């Protein structure tokens, strides 16, 4: 949670959303149901499977080398033949023991990204038409349904046309 979102303010785990990596949860008149997304599920996993192609399966093919295990006490050259290879290992190790620390840590703010950039999307295509109930979930003023749903869940939503319920239930109702 660098970007915040995941394990940040959406502190709940979507149990078994298997139709993908993301989605919503409508509480319309027709009950409920957790819908699966794409341009975000594919988007993230698009990248993860990118940084990885980099890492996994690639370079290095060396043939005849220096020896590395030793039968008798030789001194010096021996001493050296060691300290050269040792030093290599040592290095290659730190290089690895970090390629992870980085690639990994940033693998995270990479998922905690697609999130804080979807809610931050809906909360755009629709004005005073509704607000993320407190946090986590949203709050709607219209009687949106399964059909009506294919709005946000398709970026097919008019905060203009489909606006009637605006001021109303908001700050307008008695107080």
């Amino acid at each position: 949670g660098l970007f915040g979102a995941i394990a940040g303010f959406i502190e709940n785990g979507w149990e078994g959303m298997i139709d993908g990596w993301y989605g919503f949860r409508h509480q319309n008149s027709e009950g409920t149901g957790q819908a699966a997304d794409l341009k975000s599920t594919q988007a993230a996993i698009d990248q993860i499977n990118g940084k990885l192609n980099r890492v996994i399966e690639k370079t290095n093919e060396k043939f005849h080398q220096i020896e590395k295990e030793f039968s008798e006490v030789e001194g010096r050259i021996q001493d050296l033949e060691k300290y050269v290879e040792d030093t290599k290992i040592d290095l290659w190790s730190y290089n690895a023991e970090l390629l992870v620390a980085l690639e990994n840590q940033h693998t995270i703010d990479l998922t905690d990204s697609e999130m804080n950039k979807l809610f931050e999307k809906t909360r755009r295509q629709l004005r005073e038409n509704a607000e993320e109930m407190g946090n986590g979930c949203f709050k709607i003023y219209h009687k949106c349904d399964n059909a009506c749903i294919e709005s946000i869940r398709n970026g097919t939503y008019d905060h203009d046309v489909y606006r009637d319920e605006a001021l109303n239930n908001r700050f307008q109702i008695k107080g």
């Binding site: 993230a44 990885l52 093919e61 043939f63």
Partner: protein
């Protein structure tokens, strides 16, 4: 034995798909650069938050 494996280790012959191997500093051709660590897990997915009791 009869097979294929671009990588030979005095220890046996190993698969080169990973980037790192901790089988034996001595290798032959196509092979995972040798590292001290016996395991390094890499995140393929997003974080994770527990359902109930973890």
């Amino acid at each position: 034995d009869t097979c294929i494996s671009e990588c030979i280790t005095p220890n046996g012959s190993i698969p080169n798909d990973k980037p790192f191997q901790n089988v034996n500093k001595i290798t032959y051709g196509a092979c995972p650069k040798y590292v001290k660590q016996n395991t390094l897990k890499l995140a393929t997915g997003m974080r994770n938050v527990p359902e109930k009791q973890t």
